[PDB]
Amino acid sequence: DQFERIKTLGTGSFGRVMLVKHKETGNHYAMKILDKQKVVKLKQIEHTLNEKRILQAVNFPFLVKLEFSFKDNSNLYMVMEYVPGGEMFSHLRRIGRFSEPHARFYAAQIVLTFEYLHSLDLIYRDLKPENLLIDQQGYIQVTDFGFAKRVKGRTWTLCGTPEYLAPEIILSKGYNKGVDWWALGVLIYEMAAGYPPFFADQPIQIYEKIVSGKVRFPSHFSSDLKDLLRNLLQVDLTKRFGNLKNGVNDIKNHKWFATTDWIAIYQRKVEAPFIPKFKGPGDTSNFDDYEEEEIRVSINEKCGKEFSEF
Amino acid sequence: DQFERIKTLGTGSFGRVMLVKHKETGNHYAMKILDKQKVVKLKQIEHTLNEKRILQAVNFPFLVKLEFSFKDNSNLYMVMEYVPGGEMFSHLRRIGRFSEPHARFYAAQIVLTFEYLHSLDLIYRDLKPENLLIDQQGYIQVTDFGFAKRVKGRTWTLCGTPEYLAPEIILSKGYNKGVDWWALGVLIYEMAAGYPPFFADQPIQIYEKIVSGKVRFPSHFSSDLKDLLRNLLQVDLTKRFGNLKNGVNDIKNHKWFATTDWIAIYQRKVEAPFIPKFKGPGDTSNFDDYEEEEIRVSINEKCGKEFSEF
Amino acid sequence: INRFTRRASVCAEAYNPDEEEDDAESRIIHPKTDDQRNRLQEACKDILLFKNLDPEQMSQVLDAMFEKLVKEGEHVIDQGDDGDNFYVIDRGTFDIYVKCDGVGRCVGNYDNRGSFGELALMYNTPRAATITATSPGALWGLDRVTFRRIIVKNNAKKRKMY
Amino acid sequence: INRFTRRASVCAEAYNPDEEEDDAESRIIHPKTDDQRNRLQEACKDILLFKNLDPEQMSQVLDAMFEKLVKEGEHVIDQGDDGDNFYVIDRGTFDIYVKCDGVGRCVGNYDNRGSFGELALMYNTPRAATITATSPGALWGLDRVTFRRIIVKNNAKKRKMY
């Protein structure tokens, strides 16, 4: 416990994350506690092992550093670099909807990270708007990578979220990329219409809408992406025109997507279209007013022989 | 020292209904308990004084003959009749779509109770799905009558239908008893379409939908109901069907009520379509359950002169 | 089958129509400039309540309007407590945070428009929002007591005069 | 603007039929009468899971079934513990009382009609609600472990051979 805590940063099914100050240098960093309670109550050691094996030899601009990792007799704390700025979903909900350049940059970053993951045979798995961090220099970062896999192979994993699924995952059918593409067709919708994509008071309606691929043309939508949205939803994948294995010779040759200078985007140089307003060390204006829950340290050994790989 | 409580039946933002049993004879009954702590802060003695006279103003079958109330140092109790059956809101939520006979019977009962309330010129004021209980005898009963009041002049105490509020009162203006139909008209939608009327959560959207004269008509409504809903669509409901001489001509002579007979129901002798199952005394299975909450209040006087009339 | 909703009782403040005695014309007096008054009128015209009001009531509210200067890092209004005030962001930007199961999620801000706590004047209800300072600014508005009093007085005058 | 519900994960046991366990072809068939199977097929031939399935898998699922006699008044399932079973509506009135924020409320009574409990087979989710038995009856206790194992094994064998 060589880290002085300050204030909690987030709590959810994924776990708990707090803010700490490096005693050996003095810098704000994030500390994620594995807890292991829900892991033992829900069996989630395979995902953690896969994420560890992946991070053991994986490093790219769209990834968070792994600096010092601490395991106790019954707990584990992973340290990471903090990126003051907040998630983009908060700003999207505060304003309403972004413009066409914003969606273009989002799609460019998505295809870039997809190509980066495919270069080393990897699958993103989970994808939600609550896993993005925008710094002051424009360097975007992604968090939450436990839902991944070393090699694609051919398994039958079931996870994610009900709001991002396809018929291939409901009845496992490999979905080596459909889960990462079909669901993506709805992501843009969340950043286009003035209301959430799925709005129903029962999961049966959501399942029926996911199975019955049909996008409802909003009352105010650009005619450029209309044709793309009218075909993004499909069953198979070979029939899709823009779906080459390279993934660069299809999105660049699109109608609206043409001037996407990826050479300057992948090199981290072009500034983001919306930089957050800073104020001081560890800003909180962009983040929510969440409070801190009851914290508890370790007492004795209970499940220390779990991650027996270090 | 007469009635002993058993368990709780349901608490709200005004009172708590619970089950009680007499110590002398022994019979299950309902008892509404209220705490003056919340009334002193809001100051609502005018609405409570009406119950003192409504207790005696009862000379009809529909009018529930309330029992004698009892005021304590910091709590009030009022015993009422027992309802082995349940509420209509629960049945509607369970089914969500009534047939033709059931809808006709409900409309006839609504018209009968409205005529009964108008005969005495007693403003109903309060109106919600919870104010409709189904007795074991196969009839309908109304609860919560404290909001009733008859004043020569106008009024301004806005309290009763916050969601189903006509656009004539949202602007802080007067109103008449005819509004009781409007606030209830939307309810018929729940017994026709299958989903709630307002498909939103923010009050702004509800107000915009109420002010915006537009109501859908799926392929599930009747023939006369469609015309009745289309006739009432303007913002300033000036051509109301209730604001007439007797108020029982255009509604009874309408095509919806092709066959009616109020004399048969006046004497109470027509079996309901389906009476709730009565599994002997204490059949509280139809009603919704609730956590137990005893009376934890200190025996101390708190403004007695303010609660003299009772 | 459905998420469902609560059926909580709603409340509003009462009044005694028999009490005709009131202020001479207005208690708070603060005549602003012409540009500020025009901007406030244009911002209020977008509200549904100001669609049927006459110029007389508009001028009365403008003359009786109350201005409050909020500095940086200031905090007065808080959630949970019974709401008893109302203001309008005349300029600047202030993000509002609303509770969401123990998480003060954001809703947005306003810029020379909007109305923080516009529904609180329609009925008495606890504070369902949380405001936070950002920079020096001025907010124009009126509390619920005086607003309701003026509204009821105008209603009674329009009802009895005719 | 909206309550904004949470978006928790829906992970579960990663069933990798390749080198797991030791047994093989553990079908464990439980035959019964023909009238019961014929009556259950009418409802089984309309679910989203059975609307697009091989006849062999449907026949195997219909053959594999365990019965459980439940009398009146028995809290076999309660909102709180983890959920691993799929109950079929065979006969008898069963009330679905959900603890909406710690308050019991009837969702939808089932009487030899409808279909429920399939959600438990979608992913790891706790008990949906309390299933109160108003009278004696015989329900179908289909555990989650059996359903994915053959349903994935048949597909794997077909993909390996065909």
Numbering used by the authors:
A (entry chain B), B (entry chain A): 96 to 405
C (entry chain C), D (entry chain D): 104 to 265
Structure paper excerpt:
The mutant is translated as a stable protein where the J-domain (residues 1 to 69) of DnaJB1 is fused to the cAMP-dependent protein kinase (PKA) catalytic (Cα or C) subunit (PKAc) (residues 15 to 336). In its resting physiological state, PKA exists as an inactive holoenzyme, which is composed of 2 C subunits and 1 R subunit dimer. All 4 R subunit isoforms share a similar domain organization which consists of an N-terminal Dimerization/Docking (D/D) domain followed by an intrinsically disordered linker that connects to 2 tandem cyclic nucleotide binding (CNB) domains. To provide mechanistic insight into the functional consequences of the DnaJB1-PKAc fusion protein that might allow us to better understand how it is a driver of FL-HCC, we used single-particle cryo-electron microscopy (cryo-EM) to determine a structure of the RIIβ holoenzyme formed with J-C. This is the first cryo-EM structure of any PKA holoenzyme and also confirms the differences between the compact RIIβ holoenzyme and the more extended RIIα holoenzyme that was shown by negative staining EM.
To obtain higher-resolution information, we used cryo-EM to determine a structure of the RIIβ2J-C2 holoenzyme. Due to a preferred orientation on the cryo-EM grid, data were collected using a tilt angle of 40°. After 2D classification and 3D reconstruction, we are able to get the structure to an average resolution of 6.2Å with C2 symmetry imposed. The structures revealed clear density in the core region of RIIβ2J-C2 holoenzyme, but density for the J-domain in the J-C subunits as well as for the CNB-B domains in the RIIβ subunits was missing. In addition, the density for the entire A-helix as well as the linker that wraps around the N-lobe that connects the A-helix to the β-strand 1 was missing. It is flexible with a break at Asp96J-C (equivalent to Asp41C in the WT C subunit). The density for the B/C/N-helix ends after the C-helix in the CNB-A domain (Tyr265RIIβ), while density for the N-helix in the CNB-B domain is missing. This is the precise break between the 2 CNB domains. Presumably, these unresolved or flexible domains are dynamic regions that form continuous states under cryo-EM conditions. The organization of the DnaJB1-PKAc RIIβ holoenzyme (RIIβ2J-C2) is similar to what was found earlier in the previously solved crystal structure of the WT RIIβ holoenzyme (RIIβ2C2); the compact overall quaternary organization was not altered by the addition of the J-domain, which is also resolved in our structure.
